[PDB]
Design an enzyme around this catalytic site. Structure first.
Site, mmCIF file in Angstrom:
data_model
loop_
_atom_site.group_PDB
_atom_site.id
_atom_site.type_symbol
_atom_site.label_atom_id
_atom_site.label_comp_id
_atom_site.label_asym_id
_atom_site.label_seq_id
_atom_site.Cartn_x
_atom_site.Cartn_y
_atom_site.Cartn_z
ATOM 1 N N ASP A 1 0.837 -1.190 0.000
ATOM 2 C CA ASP A 1 0.000 0.000 0.000
ATOM 3 C C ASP A 1 0.881 1.253 0.000
ATOM 4 O O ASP A 1 1.378 1.670 1.062
ATOM 5 C CB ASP A 1 -0.873 -0.008 1.243
ATOM 6 C CG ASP A 1 -1.793 1.198 1.302
ATOM 7 O OD1 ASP A 1 -1.910 1.901 0.312
ATOM 8 O OD2 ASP A 1 -2.412 1.387 2.393
ATOM 9 N N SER B 1 -0.795 15.686 -11.919
ATOM 10 C CA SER B 1 -1.039 15.339 -13.305
ATOM 11 C C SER B 1 -1.304 16.606 -14.123
ATOM 12 O O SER B 1 -1.852 17.584 -13.600
ATOM 13 C CB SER B 1 -2.266 14.389 -13.385
ATOM 14 O OG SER B 1 -2.697 14.150 -14.682
#
EC number: 3.4.23.22
Length: 330
Positions: free
Chosen positions: A35, A199
């Site tokens: 994770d 992004s």
């Protein structure tokens, strides 16, 4: 040193991935959920409340010649999905894919929440976010990656998750055969303890690319792609009959649909998520309403590039003095 381990979807939907991990002496092999959005290595154990264990493999520290109680240390964690676990702490030898760390903090669960109990395939978590998020008290502990780093050939790990197929986690090297083209690297903020990046925009299907900054985290422990409501609405508007269902808890779509792809930007590069990756199947067994793999991050307080996005790429988690992320097509 290096390590290389195969990661395997737990079910037909890729709801999570499990990777075998050797703990203790002789080795006890547990299947952990790696994770990159958390920083605790915790396991089902001989200490876990018996009614909260249903099929998991447990770690038994008393059977490990190298286990040592970390006296006085406790831990307690709550995840974004509402699940939780807590317990005490041992140090022991932990190996992943041939890479060994001695003295790793292994957090032994005394209590786990219902979603953990109900998932027999996951024996615990191995956190790969920054060690600033580790919950051990009163002495915070390091992640497996942070403890391995100085020994690695390069201070990196990579995630290569499969779509409905196994993939690979590598430690200490970048497998230049595992991706196509070049790797585009992008800046990381460690301020919230995550692999947080920005992004450069998105496209829906064959549509034009929208240049827009989307800050979010690269999180292998989250199944879906969570993005701003504007982006998510623009995606589902291209699917006839898709709608946000407050009763189901997100966007659903007709199981008869063919889904468009979704592209996200990494600098000037583009990662394309095929439409099929966005199908999470019937909302309940036999339903003709299907659950979407792109959902709104509204109310979560962060955008999350979970497995839906990451499995479309070869992803480099660069833990050099200034961390960065890399993405390549594959």
């Amino acid at each position: 040193s290096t390590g290389s381990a195969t990661t395997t979807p737990i079910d037909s939907l890729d709801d999570a991935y499990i990777t075998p991990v050797q703990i203790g002496t002789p080795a006890q092999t547990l299947n952990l959920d790696f994770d990159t959005g958390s920083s605790d290595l915790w396991v089902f154990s001989s200490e876990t409340t018996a009614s909260e264990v249903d099929g998991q493999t447990i770690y038994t520290p008393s059977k490990s010649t190298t286990a040592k109680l970390l006296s006085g240390a406790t831990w307690s964690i709550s995840y974004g999905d509402g699940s939780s676990s807590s317990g005490d702490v041992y140090t022991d030898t932990v190996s992943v894919g041939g890479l060994t760390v001695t003295g790793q903090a292994v957090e032994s669960a005394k209590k786990v929440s219902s979603s953990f109990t109900e998932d027999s395939t996951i024996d615990g978590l191995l956190g790969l976010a920054f060690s600033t998020l580790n919950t051990v008290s009163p002495t915070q502990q390091k992640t497996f990656f942070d403890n391995a780093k100085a020994s690695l050939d390069s201070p990196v790990f990579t995630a290569d998750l499969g779509y409905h197929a196994p993939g690979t986690y590598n430690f200490g090297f970048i497998d230049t055969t595992a991706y196509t083209g070049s790797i585009t690297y992008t800046a990381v903020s460690t301020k919230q303890g995550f692999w947080e990046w920005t992004s450069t925009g998105y496209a829906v299907g064959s549509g034009t690319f929208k240049s827009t900054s989307i800050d979010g985290i690269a999180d292998t422990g989250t199944t879906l792609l969570y993005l701003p409501a504007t982006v998510v609405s623009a995606y589902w508007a291209q699917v006839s009959g898709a709608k946000s269902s407050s009763s189901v808890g997100g966007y659903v779509f007709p199981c008869s649909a063919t889904l468009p792809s979704f592209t996200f930007g990494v600098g000037s590069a583009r990662i394309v998520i095929p439409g099929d990756y966005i199908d999470f199947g019937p909302i309940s067994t036999g339903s003709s309403s299907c659950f979407g793999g792109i959902q709104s991050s509204a109310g979560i307080g962060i955008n999350i590039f979970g497995d839906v996005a990451l499995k479309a790429a070869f992803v480099v988690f660069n833990g050099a003095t200034t961390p960065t992320l890399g993405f390549a097509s594959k």
